Amino acid sequence: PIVRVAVLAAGDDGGRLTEMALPSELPLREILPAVQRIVQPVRLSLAPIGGAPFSLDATLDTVGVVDGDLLALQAVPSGPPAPRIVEDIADAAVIFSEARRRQWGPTHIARGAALALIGLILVGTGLSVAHRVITGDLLGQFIVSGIALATVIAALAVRNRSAVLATSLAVTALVPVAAAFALGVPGDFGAPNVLLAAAGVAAWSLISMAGSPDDRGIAVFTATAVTGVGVLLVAGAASLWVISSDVIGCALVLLGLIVTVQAAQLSAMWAVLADLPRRVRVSQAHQTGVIAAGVLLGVAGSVALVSSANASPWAWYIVVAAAAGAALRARVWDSAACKAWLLGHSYLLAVALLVAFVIGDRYQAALWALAALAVLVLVWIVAALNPKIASPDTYSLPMRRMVGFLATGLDASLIPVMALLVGLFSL
Amino acid sequence: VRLSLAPIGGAPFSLDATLDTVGVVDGDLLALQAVPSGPPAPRIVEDIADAAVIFSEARRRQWGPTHIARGAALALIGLILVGTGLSVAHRVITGDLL
Amino acid sequence: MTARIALASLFVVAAVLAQPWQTTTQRWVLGVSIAAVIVLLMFLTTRIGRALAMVRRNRDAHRATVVLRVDPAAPAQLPVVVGYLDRYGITCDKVRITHRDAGGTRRSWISLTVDAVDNLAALQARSARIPLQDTTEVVGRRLADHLREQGWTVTVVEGVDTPLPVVAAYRVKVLDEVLAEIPAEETWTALEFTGSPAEPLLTVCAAVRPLAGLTPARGRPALAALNPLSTERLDGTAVPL
């Protein structure tokens, strides 16, 4: 009844990982000297990597080890931690609160000043945009462009200085850039203000994404870069070619589903092997941006169709089709944040329709928008409490093919319903 | 079959060598298992130097149901927040008992 | 298998909305849409694309592979070579067992593929760099010592074999008789197991120089990476055991 494992002991210098074959139906206190003899005042125990060490009286079969696992050699966990005793109470205040990192230091001040600068940039943008669009005065665009130039010059100057203030500063620097680049040729808030703000957002995103020194601020840059490029091209289509009454969001949801489903070749297009641990994360970072834009434009068109009244019922088919397409594409992606954005597409859709109704002066489907959000939160709760409907292992073998067939027949073949929305073949 | 004594996690004994030349001291553990047909399988060790990364992979679990609970709790907080917000933006503008 | 349904649906919604099909005003659109539905359905235009690719092409260190040679082989060592898809914390991407019938010596080869992005953390714990090749050496020698333990003689090789000259590739739809069949002066079969060896899924490739129930590789890359030293996945969908 011998079982073969591979043990990992790394305490002295580096580590040793060796395969071996331990005779099972023996208590672990007998075969721990064998492992310590091969691979090596505290006793040790075999611990499966991802868990807690084992009771030494329990054997390897009745503890859940399959043939070929990887087990580390850890300590028999702990005991009593010898607790401290003080009887004066002011001494109890000064002793028992030390282990906190309560130290103020000259490293909380840097986080405070960087957060103060980010708050100043954001609230200066908010104040001067509310100064520009509520009254009429070009002091607003002047001050927004001034703080935007100030934060861009402060962003590009600390690229090789602190490298975390720079990246977060460049993320918060594309709110004042987008607010400055939506005020030229004022009009009545217009069509091409969106175009110029999109060009500025995509320009800053593409100059700071490839110019980024490291991670932690890559995925939001490629997300807003694909968002800026997509709404830039659709604003170009809506500014020059056709008047484009209800079909801005039509091209937007088409571009969102195109960016979502053809994301493997796209994500590969944005891409000694020492810095291979970097690149794959960066590669996965780009995926966690791009699907986000594949949600965001997928939101940013679906909020355009059914914002007002008098739309088509086929628009109410195509927004549910966009929701099912961007939610049923979750199982084909492996990582966590990709699945999170794909499952949260419909959540952002419900909140976006609710806020578009509450600006849209309806308040009759806004309660129903909250009802749809309650339905989604309810199915989230049911799939979260008992893991049955969220686990596809307890399903059927042709049911998977039928569900995937329905998905690829709804997200791809919504283009006749798109031709019914635009009237593309009433021409 | 060809059964022989083996130390724990070790190759079975060469059958024509005694228990004194093999190096078994009084107070060992032996198990009766069959002789492997071939080499003694020298169990090649490959060195590691940064093994704490491996634990950094295993405690960093996948999607599973654990992230579903975090998503569900976040959806509940967001629903309660916007259910306050829509309702108060209604009642500030114009509001009946609904 | 996605966009062709979209173009066919756009064409048939370009077709039916010409219900006055008279005097060639939208009857022209009717004719070109019924002609464009029947021509895009993708096996005649991927015939075009495959022609472009195969006449175009006529002029890494991310995946690595270690192959071993086993002379007196059989499927009787089949579990101990299918279980190594994921154990000892290394997650081998595919295991491939290829057999040569050039004469009477059905020469058998076992190739193990280890990526550098499916076990990035496992290889990064070895050193500060990524020693992928040495780790593939260690996994190959572990399979060598295990198979020499269990009975059948194996040897680590590095000039391993040639199933193409490094000549007719076919693939069967899985399962035991159709490989018992597999002419001319070269005969080759190849199984490839992958995907979570508790529930493993296997792909099949073969070559002679259609037989019973096989299908040719019409458009050659399947012979190009059929050498077990190569780093590929033996294109074709895997079957449920």
PDB file of N, CA and C in Angstrom, chain B residues 34-78:
ATOM      1  N   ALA B  34       8.003  -5.637  -2.059  1.00  0.00           N
ATOM      2  CA  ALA B  34       8.600  -6.399  -3.142  1.00  0.00           C
ATOM      3  C   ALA B  34       9.856  -5.709  -3.671  1.00  0.00           C
ATOM      4  N   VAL B  35      10.667  -6.477  -4.387  1.00  0.00           N
ATOM      5  CA  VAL B  35      11.907  -5.947  -4.957  1.00  0.00           C
ATOM      6  C   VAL B  35      11.591  -5.283  -6.295  1.00  0.00           C
ATOM      7  N   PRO B  36      12.014  -4.035  -6.510  1.00  0.00           N
ATOM      8  CA  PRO B  36      11.790  -3.390  -7.810  1.00  0.00           C
ATOM      9  C   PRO B  36      12.669  -4.013  -8.883  1.00  0.00           C
ATOM     10  N   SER B  37      12.059  -4.343 -10.016  1.00  0.00           N
ATOM     11  CA  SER B  37      12.767  -5.026 -11.096  1.00  0.00           C
ATOM     12  C   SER B  37      13.606  -4.012 -11.864  1.00  0.00           C
ATOM     13  N   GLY B  38      14.822  -3.772 -11.383  1.00  0.00           N
ATOM     14  CA  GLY B  38      15.752  -2.930 -12.093  1.00  0.00           C
ATOM     15  C   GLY B  38      16.692  -2.159 -11.189  1.00  0.00           C
ATOM     16  N   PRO B  39      16.753  -0.847 -11.383  1.00  0.00           N
ATOM     17  CA  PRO B  39      17.706  -0.020 -10.643  1.00  0.00           C
ATOM     18  C   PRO B  39      17.176   0.310  -9.260  1.00  0.00           C
ATOM     19  N   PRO B  40      18.022   0.799  -8.351  1.00  0.00           N
ATOM     20  CA  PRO B  40      17.538   1.193  -7.024  1.00  0.00           C
ATOM     21  C   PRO B  40      16.774   2.510  -6.975  1.00  0.00           C
ATOM     22  N   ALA B  41      16.539   3.175  -8.127  1.00  0.00           N
ATOM     23  CA  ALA B  41      15.835   4.453  -8.273  1.00  0.00           C
ATOM     24  C   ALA B  41      16.429   5.533  -7.374  1.00  0.00           C
ATOM     25  N   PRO B  42      17.582   6.131  -7.745  1.00  0.00           N
ATOM     26  CA  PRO B  42      18.334   6.985  -6.809  1.00  0.00           C
ATOM     27  C   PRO B  42      17.687   8.291  -6.348  1.00  0.00           C
ATOM     28  N   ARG B  43      16.437   8.570  -6.746  1.00  0.00           N
ATOM     29  CA  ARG B  43      15.561   9.648  -6.238  1.00  0.00           C
ATOM     30  C   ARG B  43      16.243  11.021  -6.305  1.00  0.00           C
ATOM     31  N   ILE B  44      16.411  11.468  -7.554  1.00  0.00           N
ATOM     32  CA  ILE B  44      17.188  12.668  -7.853  1.00  0.00           C
ATOM     33  C   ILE B  44      16.563  13.904  -7.218  1.00  0.00           C
ATOM     34  N   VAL B  45      17.390  14.662  -6.506  1.00  0.00           N
ATOM     35  CA  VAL B  45      16.986  15.884  -5.825  1.00  0.00           C
ATOM     36  C   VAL B  45      17.284  17.069  -6.733  1.00  0.00           C
ATOM     37  N   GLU B  46      16.315  17.970  -6.866  1.00  0.00           N
ATOM     38  CA  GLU B  46      16.509  19.228  -7.570  1.00  0.00           C
ATOM     39  C   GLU B  46      16.426  20.373  -6.572  1.00  0.00           C
ATOM     40  N   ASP B  47      17.432  21.238  -6.594  1.00  0.00           N
ATOM     41  CA  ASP B  47      17.546  22.282  -5.591  1.00  0.00           C
ATOM     42  C   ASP B  47      16.534  23.390  -5.845  1.00  0.00           C
ATOM     43  N   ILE B  48      16.109  24.031  -4.759  1.00  0.00           N
ATOM     44  CA  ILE B  48      15.284  25.229  -4.793  1.00  0.00           C
ATOM     45  C   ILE B  48      15.906  26.240  -3.844  1.00  0.00           C
ATOM     46  N   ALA B  49      15.669  27.522  -4.113  1.00  0.00           N
ATOM     47  CA  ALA B  49      16.238  28.581  -3.290  1.00  0.00           C
ATOM     48  C   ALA B  49      15.226  29.600  -2.799  1.00  0.00           C
ATOM     49  N   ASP B  50      14.011  29.609  -3.334  1.00  0.00           N
ATOM     50  CA  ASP B  50      13.002  30.619  -3.038  1.00  0.00           C
ATOM     51  C   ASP B  50      11.644  29.951  -2.854  1.00  0.00           C
ATOM     52  N   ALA B  51      11.600  28.938  -1.980  1.00  0.00           N
ATOM     53  CA  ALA B  51      10.446  28.046  -1.879  1.00  0.00           C
ATOM     54  C   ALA B  51       9.199  28.726  -1.335  1.00  0.00           C
ATOM     55  N   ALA B  52       9.345  29.877  -0.673  1.00  0.00           N
ATOM     56  CA  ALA B  52       8.195  30.609  -0.153  1.00  0.00           C
ATOM     57  C   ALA B  52       7.287  31.144  -1.253  1.00  0.00           C
ATOM     58  N   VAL B  53       7.777  31.216  -2.492  1.00  0.00           N
ATOM     59  CA  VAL B  53       6.925  31.565  -3.621  1.00  0.00           C
ATOM     60  C   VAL B  53       5.901  30.467  -3.884  1.00  0.00           C
ATOM     61  N   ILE B  54       6.274  29.196  -3.663  1.00  0.00           N
ATOM     62  CA  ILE B  54       5.363  28.076  -3.917  1.00  0.00           C
ATOM     63  C   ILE B  54       4.148  28.154  -3.001  1.00  0.00           C
ATOM     64  N   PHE B  55       4.385  28.424  -1.711  1.00  0.00           N
ATOM     65  CA  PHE B  55       3.298  28.711  -0.781  1.00  0.00           C
ATOM     66  C   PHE B  55       2.513  29.937  -1.222  1.00  0.00           C
ATOM     67  N   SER B  56       3.211  30.944  -1.760  1.00  0.00           N
ATOM     68  CA  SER B  56       2.557  32.132  -2.294  1.00  0.00           C
ATOM     69  C   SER B  56       1.677  31.824  -3.497  1.00  0.00           C
ATOM     70  N   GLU B  57       1.859  30.669  -4.134  1.00  0.00           N
ATOM     71  CA  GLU B  57       0.914  30.220  -5.139  1.00  0.00           C
ATOM     72  C   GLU B  57      -0.263  29.475  -4.532  1.00  0.00           C
ATOM     73  N   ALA B  58      -0.033  28.668  -3.495  1.00  0.00           N
ATOM     74  CA  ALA B  58      -1.080  27.749  -3.061  1.00  0.00           C
ATOM     75  C   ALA B  58      -2.097  28.419  -2.147  1.00  0.00           C
ATOM     76  N   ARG B  59      -1.647  29.311  -1.262  1.00  0.00           N
ATOM     77  CA  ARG B  59      -2.602  30.054  -0.449  1.00  0.00           C
ATOM     78  C   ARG B  59      -3.340  31.098  -1.280  1.00  0.00           C
ATOM     79  N   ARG B  60      -2.757  31.532  -2.397  1.00  0.00           N
ATOM     80  CA  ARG B  60      -3.455  32.376  -3.368  1.00  0.00           C
ATOM     81  C   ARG B  60      -4.306  31.462  -4.242  1.00  0.00           C
ATOM     82  N   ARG B  61      -5.499  31.151  -3.749  1.00  0.00           N
ATOM     83  CA  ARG B  61      -6.396  30.218  -4.413  1.00  0.00           C
ATOM     84  C   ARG B  61      -7.018  30.848  -5.658  1.00  0.00           C
ATOM     85  N   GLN B  62      -7.718  30.010  -6.418  1.00  0.00           N
ATOM     86  CA  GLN B  62      -8.370  30.414  -7.659  1.00  0.00           C
ATOM     87  C   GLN B  62      -9.726  31.047  -7.389  1.00  0.00           C
ATOM     88  N   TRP B  63     -10.548  31.153  -8.437  1.00  0.00           N
ATOM     89  CA  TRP B  63     -11.883  31.740  -8.368  1.00  0.00           C
ATOM     90  C   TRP B  63     -12.773  31.049  -7.344  1.00  0.00           C
ATOM     91  N   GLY B  64     -13.131  29.791  -7.607  1.00  0.00           N
ATOM     92  CA  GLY B  64     -13.841  28.954  -6.665  1.00  0.00           C
ATOM     93  C   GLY B  64     -15.188  29.495  -6.232  1.00  0.00           C
ATOM     94  N   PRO B  65     -15.621  29.124  -5.029  1.00  0.00           N
ATOM     95  CA  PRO B  65     -16.762  29.797  -4.389  1.00  0.00           C
ATOM     96  C   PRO B  65     -16.387  30.892  -3.400  1.00  0.00           C
ATOM     97  N   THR B  66     -15.103  31.055  -3.072  1.00  0.00           N
ATOM     98  CA  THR B  66     -14.716  32.048  -2.079  1.00  0.00           C
ATOM     99  C   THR B  66     -14.806  33.461  -2.630  1.00  0.00           C
ATOM    100  N   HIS B  67     -14.458  33.655  -3.900  1.00  0.00           N
ATOM    101  CA  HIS B  67     -14.646  34.957  -4.517  1.00  0.00           C
ATOM    102  C   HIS B  67     -16.107  35.242  -4.828  1.00  0.00           C
ATOM    103  N   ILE B  68     -16.933  34.200  -4.958  1.00  0.00           N
ATOM    104  CA  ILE B  68     -18.364  34.393  -5.175  1.00  0.00           C
ATOM    105  C   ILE B  68     -18.997  35.057  -3.959  1.00  0.00           C
ATOM    106  N   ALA B  69     -18.532  34.704  -2.757  1.00  0.00           N
ATOM    107  CA  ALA B  69     -19.085  35.301  -1.545  1.00  0.00           C
ATOM    108  C   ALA B  69     -18.679  36.762  -1.406  1.00  0.00           C
ATOM    109  N   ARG B  70     -17.441  37.094  -1.781  1.00  0.00           N
ATOM    110  CA  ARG B  70     -17.005  38.486  -1.769  1.00  0.00           C
ATOM    111  C   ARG B  70     -17.772  39.309  -2.794  1.00  0.00           C
ATOM    112  N   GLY B  71     -18.004  38.739  -3.979  1.00  0.00           N
ATOM    113  CA  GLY B  71     -18.810  39.425  -4.975  1.00  0.00           C
ATOM    114  C   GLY B  71     -20.254  39.602  -4.542  1.00  0.00           C
ATOM    115  N   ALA B  72     -20.808  38.606  -3.850  1.00  0.00           N
ATOM    116  CA  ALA B  72     -22.193  38.689  -3.400  1.00  0.00           C
ATOM    117  C   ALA B  72     -22.354  39.705  -2.281  1.00  0.00           C
ATOM    118  N   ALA B  73     -21.397  39.749  -1.352  1.00  0.00           N
ATOM    119  CA  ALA B  73     -21.433  40.754  -0.297  1.00  0.00           C
ATOM    120  C   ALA B  73     -21.264  42.154  -0.865  1.00  0.00           C
ATOM    121  N   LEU B  74     -20.369  42.318  -1.847  1.00  0.00           N
ATOM    122  CA  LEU B  74     -20.201  43.624  -2.473  1.00  0.00           C
ATOM    123  C   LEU B  74     -21.438  44.035  -3.262  1.00  0.00           C
ATOM    124  N   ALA B  75     -22.113  43.074  -3.893  1.00  0.00           N
ATOM    125  CA  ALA B  75     -23.354  43.380  -4.592  1.00  0.00           C
ATOM    126  C   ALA B  75     -24.459  43.756  -3.616  1.00  0.00           C
ATOM    127  N   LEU B  76     -24.472  43.136  -2.435  1.00  0.00           N
ATOM    128  CA  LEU B  76     -25.476  43.481  -1.434  1.00  0.00           C
ATOM    129  C   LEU B  76     -25.249  44.880  -0.879  1.00  0.00           C
ATOM    130  N   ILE B  77     -23.983  45.243  -0.627  1.00  0.00           N
ATOM    131  CA  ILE B  77     -23.672  46.593  -0.148  1.00  0.00           C
ATOM    132  C   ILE B  77     -24.039  47.623  -1.206  1.00  0.00           C
ATOM    133  N   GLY B  78     -23.711  47.336  -2.471  1.00  0.00           N
ATOM    134  CA  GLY B  78     -24.050  48.254  -3.543  1.00  0.00           C
ATOM    135  C   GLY B  78     -25.544  48.394  -3.755  1.00  0.00           C
TER     136      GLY B  78
END
